[model samples]
Target: DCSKNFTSPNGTIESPGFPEKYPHNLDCTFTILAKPKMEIILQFLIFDLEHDCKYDWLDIWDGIPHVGPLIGKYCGTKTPSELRSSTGILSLTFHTDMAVAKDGFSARYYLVHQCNVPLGMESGRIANEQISASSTYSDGRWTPQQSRLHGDDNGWTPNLDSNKEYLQVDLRFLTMLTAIATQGAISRETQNGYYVKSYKLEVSTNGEDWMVYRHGKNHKVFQANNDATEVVLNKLHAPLLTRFVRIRPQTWHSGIALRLELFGCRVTDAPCSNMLGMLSGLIADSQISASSTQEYLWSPSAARLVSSRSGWFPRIPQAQPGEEWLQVDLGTPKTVKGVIIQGARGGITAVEARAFVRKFKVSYSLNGKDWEYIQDPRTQQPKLFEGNMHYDTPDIRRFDPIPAQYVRVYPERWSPAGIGMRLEVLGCDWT
Candidate 1:
């Protein structure tokens, strides 16, 4: 026989003998009951304040409206007192005009109670009590941390020192080779106009042994001709493994000493598909002879040339001492394997001529300002050079392994004849 009383904030409703004001607190106490050994019970409490108050109709709605049926019902006077007083109340439910329950309000109010029941309790208790079930807390768990497509951002970064990665080589400098001889000289012969006789191309793996790749016949004077011609030695029987290639003159057309101009010799692994047309500009005049000295006049546009006598040809300005004439970027830092210099009789001599190098330097950055000198060529002890007249045997020099991105070559002094010079780069392995 548990009992409780509730009052509406607006006022309470009572029978004739009850107090007129009947406490207007509007607070209701809801109770849930269970019988000893019996898991469930059903009972309810109610307050009727305004017979037709619009707010009283709010209790008809369950808090979660979409869920079916009323959790508890108000039968009005239609519910017999005897049946309403039943102590078997299993659950209390409320309906509201607002989506959620409110703590404070001024309106006709009612009290509802509920009962605790064991799992699988008899369905009879829930049958008349109208149950409303919903899934409000179903999806309140975990979420994704980040939202971005993977692998499409930056370039592929590889492991350290991986040679398996292809290298990007850029050929931006010219490869110059030269020969100079005076008229009536044993090698006196002019192809275009400058003195030059027979030219020979040689290939070698080791500098000690050489194989002739091509040989120009007698008096094929290079300087005598006005038109530029390319003497391409495409078919070289030498093994691809050979690392050195040399071009020499066998005889002069006028039996006079002459100069050879070799320019724009570049090799790169960079894709040539887009640069094929631009690359054609790399091959300069490939032939020259003595009879056509006037036609073979050296110009800055074609090649850099120097002369022995002041009146013979315009004296090209010499690269000032300590001045950087040119720079070679091996694309990236690599171990320099070798360097070859080509010349004719009037070219550089072993005694008077020398190469002045700042140092073999390297840098990771593309800007030349940040450089690290790896090899100091000046510090190296001088060595003797040996060879013959037609082609001075290449002066082969070796150095400690040095890494460099940019290589600068400085001439300590010019050849006595002031003849031209050319450079050939050899093997460079990068890790």
Candidate 2:
């Protein structure tokens, strides 16, 4: 069929008459859909088409055919790089002229695999060196490396079943962990069973700074396996973004022997998805500073998006341009692509929800002493970036990528209530 719909988690899509010349004067549409909260990844294995793209081309969209944002229009021998869908749906249209036809293109797609899907523990995709424990039981047999979803031997066993005993895994990169599964094991040596009954999870981007996984305001404790050989799966209400995760046993049966798997996708799985560490604690407090603080609560350290209750606020509500600025030191030079900004809301009511930046400009500095404002390529002048209109909703804006160690946001206009804002820079590591 020339046009088709794909609902399966993974599949192949190709132009008409694959491995042979495609039919001329054809128009085809392919739609790939995944369950909500899951993103689709598409990669081109083989691509051959007419030159120039005027006569024949393939158009890819983020969602619907024309309603969604068009990812790209392609035609040529050059293969396109892998692309990821922003939403669960990805659509593509293929067109060909009557005069020429080539091999067309063959592509495969799969979901990002978060939301309850096992990441790599059982599959051995996670290295043994990355798994560790606070203390191991029995010389070498019951080590953290022994913990797999369903291995034949005994699982990881700590020195004791107390709350201090823990099994830790280093994901190597920031991941969106949505769920965890744990299983108890039956020791082959003694035929005895051991398992954790309940456990607490702690996550950290940097191993030095850790935070307990919480459900709302309270620390979350996940109920695990009741008996040996039985697996218990627990889905987190709020997803965790961390590179390091520790599972501490709160309660256990007989002894603490754990086989486990963490489920989620890498933070970079989605296109342009890296947050550059504002909310995940990659950016430290000492790295952020402002011209003036409204109060101790609204300091520059509180400007992290979504994590901070109070954002950076200026003491003077009304100020001249460039009088007040919030600065972020990225530790080392980085390629900053864009920023996400939001206003402050003290409470749920609209009345208390005030203070937002209406307009702003960004400046960059290689060294702390000198700075240069971002220039609009079209106008050849300092670019004026638009800010948020409301207090609660967030707005993101992009500019020409800049490589610098420090960046500053200068507020030009503000909401009548005041100038209070939360922010996060977006980029990948400098190449």
Q: Could you estimate the TM-score for every candidate?
A: 0.23, 0.46
Model 1: residues with Cα > 4 Å off, grouped in runs: 1-319, 344-367, 371-393
lDDT per residue (tens digit) for residues 1-431 in model 1: 11233322122322222334223223233333322122222222333333242332223211112121123344223221111111112222222232222222122222333111111102221122221111111222100100011111111111221212211111111211222111211211223322223444443322333434433433222232221222222222211222233334344332222212212211221111011111121112231111112234542212111111111111332344433233344454555544443332222335444222212222122344564433446665332222111222232233444454444333334444333332333434444
Q: Candidate 2 on 1-431: residue-level lDDT in tens?
A: 57999998889999888988889999999999776457687889999989957999998864556443355689989787566553456788999988988898999999866345677889876767668899998678899988888988899998766799889987644456889999999989899898899999987644544567777668798999989998888988866655689999998889888999999875445445456656544577788888888754555557876555667887876777778998888888888888877776554345435788999999988788899999988899889899975564456687778787888999998887778888778765666
Candidate 2 lDDT trough over 10 residues, lowest sum: 62-71
Q: What is the C-alpha RMSD of each candidate to the true structure, in Å?
A: 43.1, 17.8
Which regions in candidate 2 have their CA more than 4 angstroms from the true location? 1-117, 271-424, 427-431
Count of clashes, each model: 66, 0
